Amino acid sequence: SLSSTPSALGKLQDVVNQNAQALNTLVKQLSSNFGAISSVLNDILSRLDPPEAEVQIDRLITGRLQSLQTYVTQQLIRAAEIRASANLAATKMSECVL
Amino acid sequence: PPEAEVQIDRLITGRLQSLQTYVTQQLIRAAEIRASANLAATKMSECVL
Amino acid sequence: GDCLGDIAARDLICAQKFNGLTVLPPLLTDEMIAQYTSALLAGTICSGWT
Amino acid sequence: QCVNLTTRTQLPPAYTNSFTRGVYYPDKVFRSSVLHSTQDLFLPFFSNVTWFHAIHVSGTNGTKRFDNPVLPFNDGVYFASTEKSNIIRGWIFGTTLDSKTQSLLIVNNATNVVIKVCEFQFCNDPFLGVYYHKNNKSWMESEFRVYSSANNCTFEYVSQPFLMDLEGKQGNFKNLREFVFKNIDGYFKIYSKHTPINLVRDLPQGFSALEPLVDLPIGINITRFQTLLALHRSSSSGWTAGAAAYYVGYLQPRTFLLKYNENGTITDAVDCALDPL
Amino acid sequence: MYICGDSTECSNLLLQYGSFCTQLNRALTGIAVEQDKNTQEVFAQVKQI
Amino acid sequence: MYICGDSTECSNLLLQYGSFCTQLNRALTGIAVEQDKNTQEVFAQVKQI
Amino acid sequence: SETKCTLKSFTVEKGIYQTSNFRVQPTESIVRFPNITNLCPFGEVFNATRFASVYAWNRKRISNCVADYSVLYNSASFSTFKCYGVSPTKLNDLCFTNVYADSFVIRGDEVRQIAPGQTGKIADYNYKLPDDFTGCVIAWNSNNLDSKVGGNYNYLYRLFRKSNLKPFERDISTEIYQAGSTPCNGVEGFNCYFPLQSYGFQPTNGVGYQPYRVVVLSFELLHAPATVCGPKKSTNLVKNKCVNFNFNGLTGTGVLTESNKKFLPFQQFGRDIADTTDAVRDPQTLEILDITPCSFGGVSVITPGTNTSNQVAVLYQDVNCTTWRVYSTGSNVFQTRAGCLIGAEHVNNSYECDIPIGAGICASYQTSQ
Amino acid sequence: FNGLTGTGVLTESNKKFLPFQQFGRDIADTTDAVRDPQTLEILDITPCSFGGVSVITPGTNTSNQVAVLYQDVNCTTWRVYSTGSNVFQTRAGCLIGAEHVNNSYECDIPIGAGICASYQTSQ
Amino acid sequence: RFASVYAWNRKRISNCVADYSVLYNSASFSTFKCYGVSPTKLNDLCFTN
Numbered sequence A: 001s002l003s004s005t006p007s008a009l010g011k012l013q014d015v016v017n018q019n020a021q022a023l024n025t026l027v028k029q030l031s032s033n034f035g036a037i038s039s040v041l042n043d044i045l046s047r048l049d050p051p052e053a054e055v056q057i058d059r060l061i062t063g064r065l066q067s068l069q070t071y072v073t074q075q076l077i078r079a080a081e082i083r084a085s086a087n088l089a090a091t092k093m094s095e096c097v098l
Numbered sequence B: 001p002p003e004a005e006v007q008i009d010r011l012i013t014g015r016l017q018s019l020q021t022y023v024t025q026q027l028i029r030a031a032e033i034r035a036s037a038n039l040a041a042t043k044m045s046e047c048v049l
Numbered sequence C: 001g002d003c004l005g006d007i008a009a010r011d012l013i014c015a016q017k018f019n020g021l022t023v024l025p026p027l028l029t030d031e032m033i034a035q036y037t038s039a040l041l042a043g044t045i046c047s048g049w050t
Numbered sequence D: 001q002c003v004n005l006t007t008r009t010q011l012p013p014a015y016t017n018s019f020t021r022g023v024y025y026p027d028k029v030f031r032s033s034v035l036h037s038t039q040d041l042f043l044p045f046f047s048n049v050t051w052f053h054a055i056h057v058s059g060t061n062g063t064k065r066f067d068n069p070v071l072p073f074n075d076g077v078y079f080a081s082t083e084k085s086n087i088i089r090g091w092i093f094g095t096t097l098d099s100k101t102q103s104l105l106i107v108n109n110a111t112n113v114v115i116k117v118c119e120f121q122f123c124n125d126p127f128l129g130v131y132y133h134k135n136n137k138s139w140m141e142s143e144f145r146v147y148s149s150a151n152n153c154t155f156e157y158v159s160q161p162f163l164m165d166l167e168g169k170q171g172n173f174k175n176l177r178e179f180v181f182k183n184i185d186g187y188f189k190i191y192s193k194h195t196p197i198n199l200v201r202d203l204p205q206g207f208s209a210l211e212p213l214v215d216l217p218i219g220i221n222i223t224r225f226q227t228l229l230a231l232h233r234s235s236s237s238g239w240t241a242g243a244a245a246y247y248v249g250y251l252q253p254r255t256f257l258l259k260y261n262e263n264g265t266i267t268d269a270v271d272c273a274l275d276p277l
Numbered sequence E, F: 001m002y003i004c005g006d007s008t009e010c011s012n013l014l015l016q017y018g019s020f021c022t023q024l025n026r027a028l029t030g031i032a033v034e035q036d037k038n039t040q041e042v043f044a045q046v047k048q049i
Numbered sequence G: 001s002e003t004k005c006t007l008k009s010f011t012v013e014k015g016i017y018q019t020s021n022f023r024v025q026p027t028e029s030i031v032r033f034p035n036i037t038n039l040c041p042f043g044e045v046f047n048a049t050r051f052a053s054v055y056a057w058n059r060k061r062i063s064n065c066v067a068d069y070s071v072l073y074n075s076a077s078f079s080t081f082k083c084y085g086v087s088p089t090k091l092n093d094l095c096f097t098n099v100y101a102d103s104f105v106i107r108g109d110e111v112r113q114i115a116p117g118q119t120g121k122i123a124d125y126n127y128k129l130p131d132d133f134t135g136c137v138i139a140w141n142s143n144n145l146d147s148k149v150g151g152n153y154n155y156l157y158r159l160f161r162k163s164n165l166k167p168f169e170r171d172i173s174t175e176i177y178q179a180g181s182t183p184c185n186g187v188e189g190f191n192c193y194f195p196l197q198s199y200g201f202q203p204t205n206g207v208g209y210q211p212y213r214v215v216v217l218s219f220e221l222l223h224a225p226a227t228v229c230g231p232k233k234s235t236n237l238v239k240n241k242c243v244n245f246n247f248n249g250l251t252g253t254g255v256l257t258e259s260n261k262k263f264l265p266f267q268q269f270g271r272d273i274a275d276t277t278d279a280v281r282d283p284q285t286l287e288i289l290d291i292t293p294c295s296f297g298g299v300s301v302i303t304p305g306t307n308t309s310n311q312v313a314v315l316y317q318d319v320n321c322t323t324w325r326v327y328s329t330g331s332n333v334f335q336t337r338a339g340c341l342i343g344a345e346h347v348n349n350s351y352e353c354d355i356p357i358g359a360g361i362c363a364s365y366q367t368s369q
Numbered sequence H: 001f002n003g004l005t006g007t008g009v010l011t012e013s014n015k016k017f018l019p020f021q022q023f024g025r026d027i028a029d030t031t032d033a034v035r036d037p038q039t040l041e042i043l044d045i046t047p048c049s050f051g052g053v054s055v056i057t058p059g060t061n062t063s064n065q066v067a068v069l070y071q072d073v074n075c076t077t078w079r080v081y082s083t084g085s086n087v088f089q090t091r092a093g094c095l096i097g098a099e100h101v102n103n104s105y106e107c108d109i110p111i112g113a114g115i116c117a118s119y120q121t122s123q
Numbered sequence I: 001r002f003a004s005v006y007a008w009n010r011k012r013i014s015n016c017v018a019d020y021s022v023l024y025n026s027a028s029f030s031t032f033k034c035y036g037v038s039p040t041k042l043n044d045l046c047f048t049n
């Protein structure tokens, strides 16, 4: 049955897929300008002097920190779901197996 | 355009932050509901059936 | 057309829809849930835990 | 000087399906193995394309049609043509298309390519033409009309010389040429591509992306344009159309999802506004 | 509609970092699916009527 | 690396938010430790092999 | 010490701390520009006998030259110089692509209109910049060149128009303007106007009425092959080393290697999924080079309490020791699936776990400890 | 209206402004009413776009037919992209393009309010 | 006549069209600066006091 039903293990495959997506999202989000003239620090630094560059860079820093904070929050929520599943599994090990 | 863009971007960032806050709160609340639903399912099997 | 009729009413449901916020229906209706509940009761009274 | 052409049959316009064409590389940056979202003006997918043609069929009830109307330019133009004998030569872009304002003339005259911006006074039926000499079997340029005058000439470019093949070739259309024309912040932007074809009716279904050709620093207002065709000669009635067809569509702001292959070629695209799927 | 409803100019600015909208919608969809799942686990335990 | 990868000028600005970065990592570390704990709690029920 | 700073403590508890990433500093710099030898036509642009009327301004293409503007320091004086595109101090570090110089004469009071976002006769009817403008505006007083005693009436401007201009347009039409209900077929009087007026430039005019020469340099940056570059000397190209670089004005740090990418003839730079440059076409030899970051990562430190011992072991997660992007060795190199662990002694006895490392490996501080 | 721009649907209003008031405001502080500058009447402003659309898709690796659900449309000029055929009103919205079968089955693609869909038979 | 700066003159303007383009045929201003609006938007607006 397991061999012939690929969807059977979707619960474990889903964990893997969700984590991969969360990291791929963080990389893709680097391309956002966040109000800046450019998403590339090297472009900002090549064309602007320090006091002008600082403004554009600070816009990018704020946006980038926001992306990381979003990531961490999502991971904490997912961690809680997994903890609950793990606690259930531990209970079953004692009550069903032992 | 260039002056409006500055003022608009300030509003967009704030508006987006509000939606993110909403989603975070819904996810936390959803987890609490999930726990209640799991308990209810447990009771259905052990108290009713 | 109903939200235009309700402008005077200032219905919160229309305000939410106009600002992009919606509500999705459940998959199971109240009638469907009632049927599951009734089946469980019929089963319990007729055959207990079997 | 100018000649008002006659004997032309009056026919209704034809329309065709744009399918999935009119995509061009929107940047000067190499990308590969990615999808990319862009918001520029594009020909919408499966849009209404006006089909124009030049044809001479037979005597008695022959079609005898030669389409060279003034068309709106709107927000930019997708232009494409299918031919076998170099009939379509160039375009006129401008507003009033007379001596009161500056106009842009881009023409291949079978010697070189000439680009000018002048307060030109155009002919109502501008055309170029080739005379066929039965003696020694030669096809040679014999006529140029287009305009009766030019004045201040604020922009000018002339290409290096070449020989263009003017033969009255028979058969199926063999050459598909596509162009995109835009007028942005004073620049007349042209994108293009050349595709080998073998066909007898409307635009082939398929996909390709056009490459940037040139950014011309023109500085003028364009609201209308006209296509310049060459005639074949054996006054206003003494002409044979030859066979060619051209298609005109208009660009609209759209969002597209473009797909780049492993070598950075755009190989596919999604028109995000076409339908819910 | 929430951030930039009915406005072309702010829409084009919003697209600059619109990948954030997609992420919010995914989170809300995940909740929506879960809520129907919870209902089925509690009530549809027996598939015989 | 995520924000100011190999950029001295960006890094020096980023220092203002250094306490923010520390908190992001503390949260991730707490998760990481927990994940090994979860595995041990489920499988290592009996330490007699 | 990095751990101590991170924790804001002079004491560290037993356990494993993450300590950033292994990083590599650049040792050499690379500067590459097309080998352009001509000086830009500063004389033709700024020392012209005559300038165009503002209603019919000139435009010239500039290419295949070096933008060494220090040549103007001895003889030129500009009352106005303002860059919209880049900071002025960066002009000599950059390359420019589609570079054009717009040129005309206006009155001193009108100089303020040659800017994005302005209104007025010039801004609306004669010459307009886009709101989104990349370039620099230059202007200077020409009273001793253009003004004449009886009035220099050669310079014209448009006074009447029906609609506003779009950026960079040149309307040179002389058709009569209709201000009233009259059709103005000719007429040239009453409510019908000849649209262009002259400026009576005289040596006795006050400053606001003196002529000014205006040059606007319009250009794009860092997204296409250069045609004009600043006065910067190139260097040799260094591969497979961590270097600083400047390719046609685009700066960065990384390791350059040969690429198998094939850029289209008009492409100068390539970008990755995060829109970061990851390839360039070298400007002197048209070779495509790929760029990889110098730094990579994976470093953590295994620490006994510092109130007991100052010995630490360092784990390199992505290092396969079996000088390998390692800070130091000193033997005690143990390869595990969790990385290359350096400083710990490997023993073959199994023990209860104390400080976990990963992949089945755990450490302790034990015996001469 | 006197320099205040926007997009929307203008209708007659029952609001009565004090003599010195020109514009009205909603809870969101958006404009929701104006006094017309020449005719002294008050108009209400409603956004043109109302929303509610989702798409039911069999995998694209099978076919490209889709059905579209309009959550706020009652099909009993419908604010739909196309009337098409096979217009089925459900409590979850007006569904256009799916056939209505009175034979119940196991749920495949859930739609809502007791309705599901699947792809089957010339499918 | 213009007022002395110490005793500046304030005039009320009302019930008129602000077609400032009429000044193009005669006046020349060395200084012109708007603080509350962008100059290019002036022709689409209405003003009160």
Ligand SMILES: *[C@@H]1O[C@H](CO)[C@@H](O[C@@H]2O[C@H](CO)[C@@H](O)[C@H](O)[C@H]2NC(C)=O)[C@H](O)[C@H]1NC(C)=O
Pocket (backbone or CB within 6 Å): D095, D221, D222, D223, G162, G163, G164, G165, G166
């Ligand atoms: C570009 O050309 C068009 C066509 O001549 C100009 O539009 C006309 O403007 C006049 C004056 O306002 C109107 O009476 C006409 O009805 C308009 N015609 C059309 C087809 O719109 C347009 O103003 C010109 N562009 C610029 C910047 O001057």
Ligand SMILES: *[C@@H]1O[C@H](CO)[C@@H](O)[C@H](O)[C@H]1NC(C)=O
Pocket (backbone or CB within 6 Å): D001, D002, D003, D004, D124
């Ligand atoms: C073409 O016809 C128009 C009238 O429609 C006339 O004004 C023009 O002069 C004619 N041109 C020639 C070359 O005969």
Ligand SMILES: *[C@@H]1O[C@H](CO)[C@@H](O)[C@H](O)[C@H]1NC(C)=O
Pocket (backbone or CB within 6 Å): D015, D048
């Ligand atoms: C436009 O395309 C439609 C098909 O989508 C066709 O029926 C119609 O005849 C075409 N031409 C015009 C002028 O509408």
Ligand SMILES: *[C@@H]1O[C@H](CO)[C@@H](O)[C@H](O)[C@H]1NC(C)=O
Pocket (backbone or CB within 6 Å): D109, D110, D111, D112, D114, D141, D144, D158
């Ligand atoms: C093409 O134009 C060029 C430039 O005006 C001219 O010298 C040449 O003779 C023309 N050739 C023909 C066939 O008209």
Ligand SMILES: *[C@@H]1O[C@H](CO)[C@@H](O)[C@H](O)[C@H]1NC(C)=O
Pocket (backbone or CB within 6 Å): D133, D135, D136, D138
């Ligand atoms: C062919 O002969 C004609 C005269 O009959 C002459 O005018 C023409 O130039 C000749 N063609 C060539 C290619 O020599």
Ligand SMILES: *[C@@H]1O[C@H](CO)[C@@H](O)[C@H](O)[C@H]1NC(C)=O
Pocket (backbone or CB within 6 Å): D151, D152, G056, G172
């Ligand atoms: C355009 O040409 C006419 C020819 O009569 C001339 O009077 C006018 O000054 C010219 N305009 C420009 C800008 O050269």
Ligand SMILES: *[C@@H]1O[C@H](CO)[C@@H](O)[C@H](O)[C@H]1NC(C)=O
Pocket (backbone or CB within 6 Å): D261, D262, D263
């Ligand atoms: C890329 O070019 C090579 C030849 O250099 C060719 O073999 C390969 O098929 C091309 N890749 C794609 C995706 O077309």
Ligand SMILES: *[C@@H]1O[C@H](CO)[C@@H](O)[C@H](O)[C@H]1NC(C)=O
Pocket (backbone or CB within 6 Å): G042, G043, G044, G046, G047, G072, G075
């Ligand atoms: C202009 O000419 C003078 C000599 O009359 C010369 O000293 C000066 O450097 C020249 N300026 C430029 C830009 O060539």
Ligand SMILES: *[C@@H]1O[C@H](CO)[C@@H](O)[C@H](O)[C@H]1NC(C)=O
Pocket (backbone or CB within 6 Å): G035, G283, G284, G285
């Ligand atoms: C000069 O440029 C050519 C073409 O890009 C290149 O082949 C040559 O090596 C360059 N040379 C120098 C600085 O000697």
Ligand SMILES: *[C@@H]1O[C@H](CO)[C@@H](O)[C@H](O)[C@H]1NC(C)=O
Pocket (backbone or CB within 6 Å): G320, G322, G335, G336, G337, G338
């Ligand atoms: C190190 O490389 C060798 C191949 O040279 C490989 O067999 C070994 O497994 C690698 N070490 C680790 C920890 O993966």
Ligand SMILES: *[C@@H]1O[C@H](CO)[C@@H](O)[C@H](O)[C@H]1NC(C)=O
Pocket (backbone or CB within 6 Å): H038, H039
């Ligand atoms: C002028 O304004 C008044 C309101 O003050 C209005 O009643 C009248 O109809 C308007 N009329 C015109 C343009 O005739």
Ligand SMILES: *[C@@H]1O[C@H](CO)[C@@H](O)[C@H](O)[C@H]1NC(C)=O
Pocket (backbone or CB within 6 Å): H074, H075, H076, H089, H090, H091, H092, H093
């Ligand atoms: C649609 O309108 C009809 C009245 O024409 C009403 O009976 C029906 O309940 C409405 N449908 C829904 C889903 O509300």
